[PDB]
């Protein structure tokens, strides 16, 4: 119901955008040896890269929603980013589950 919670994370230009975000992390020295679970939630890249797969795959399932007995002749099969999303299911939505 609230429009926002933390200015220091949700807002553009916050410390998280200059920390865990990759676009400003490149200004700093950093290593891939230490994975950051929250780094995906501050990227301008990985978030849109996952959301675009979600909004397209959802419509791809809706194209397959009706049975072939009533829909147009077409194959019915898993959409891409379907079984593959299982590892990141809490984070494919970036909903941060649990």
């Amino acid at each position: 119901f609230a429009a926002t919670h933390n200015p220091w994370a949700s807002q553009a230009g916050c410390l998280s955008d200059v920390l865990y975000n990759t676009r400003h992390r490149e200004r700093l020295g950093y290593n891939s040896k230490f994975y950051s679970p929250c780094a995906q939630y501050f990227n301008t890249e990985e978030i849109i890269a996952a959301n675009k797969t979600l909004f397209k795959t959802i419509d791809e399932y809706l194209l397959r929603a009706k049975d072939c007995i009533r829909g147009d002749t077409d194959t019915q099969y898993v959409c891409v980013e379907g079984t593959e999303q299982l590892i990141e299911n809490p984070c494919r939505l970036t909903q941060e589950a649990l």
Partner: protein, 285 residues
């Protein structure tokens, strides 16, 4: 051994009629597999609107090249060449070929359609086929691009803008190319910003530190070819831990640039099909 692909997207006959023209192509595959999605095909999975050149080849370097062979219903029958055997590879088309040319792979840089570019889109997805270019054209275009990363830092000089105007036109047998500018929107690419520091850092550290190491080898004698070199080292003219870390800061910049330098050949031209629609080549790599 044959590698297969699958097209979950529906294939219009107009697109498969372009796909049948690709009897062979140097299609990259990130990971050798018995079966693979079309999303793994091409360099398009690595596409970036930011980094541009260099990262395209530093990720292309590990790609497993594979020729196309035949096409079936919503699936590709890719075939991995054996080393040393001849194969009728298709050209990517920018450059006409002649007998005996060396060949190597480069990231795409379109300037309109190339001579062999039938566009094929399957819903937002696109296939960017890697370049197959003669080796001297690759080393020269790499020199022009690293030079573009040097001069682009100060565009404003008219002598520099005329300089970029002069170096932009590479030429070949009836070729008429125009080098793309990596530095779109004035700001330097992060790849150009890193690749230029990879050389300019050594350009300073080697100039400062070359004396101390030639010094101990100067008093020692053999053919003494090294002792004379310090006299020209002087033409352009003290901490322990700084001497330690500084050499570790040297090779770390030297080494990734070696991928920008060395370029293993992948094919060699022999007999040429008329109008360069195809060419047999010896696979390598």
């Amino acid at each position: 051994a044959n590698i297969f692909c699958t097209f979950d997207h529906k294939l219009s006959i107009a697109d498969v009629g372009k796909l049948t023209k690709l009897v062979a192509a140097v299609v990259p595959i990130p990971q050798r597999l018995h079966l693979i999605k079309h999303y793994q095909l091409g360099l398009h999975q690595f596409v970036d609107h930011t980094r541009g050149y260099v990262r395209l080849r530093g990720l292309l370097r590990n790609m497993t090249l594979t020729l196309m062979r035949r096409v079936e219903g919503n699936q590709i029958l890719l075939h991995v060449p054996t080393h040393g055997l001849l194969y009728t590879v298709l050209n990517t088309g920018p450059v006409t070929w002649e007998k005996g040319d060396a060949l190597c792979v480069l990231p795409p840089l379109f300037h309109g359609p190339l001579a062999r570019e039938n566009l094929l889109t399957l819903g937002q997805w696109e296939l960017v086929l890697p370049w197959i270019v003669p080796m001297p054209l690759a080393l020269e275009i790499n020199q022009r691009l690293l030079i573009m990363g040097l001069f682009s830092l100060d565009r404003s000089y008219e002598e520099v803008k005329a300089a970029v105007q002069q170096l932009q036109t590479i030429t070949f047998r009836d070729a008429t190319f125009t080098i793309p500018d990596p530095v779109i929107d004035q700001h330097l690419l992060i790849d150009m910003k890193t690749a230029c520091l990879s050389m300019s850092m050594v350009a300073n550290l080697a100039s400062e530190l070359t004396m101390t190491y030639v010094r101990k080898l100067a008093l020692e004698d053999s053919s003494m070819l090294l002792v004379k070199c310090q006299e020209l080292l002087m033409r352009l003219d003290v901490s322990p831990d700084d001497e330690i870390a500084r050499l570790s800061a040297l090779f770390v910049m030297l080494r990734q640039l070696d991928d920008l330098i060395r370029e293993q050949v992948v094919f060699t031209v022999c007999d040429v099909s008329p109008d360069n629609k195809s060419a047999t080549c010896i696979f390598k790599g």
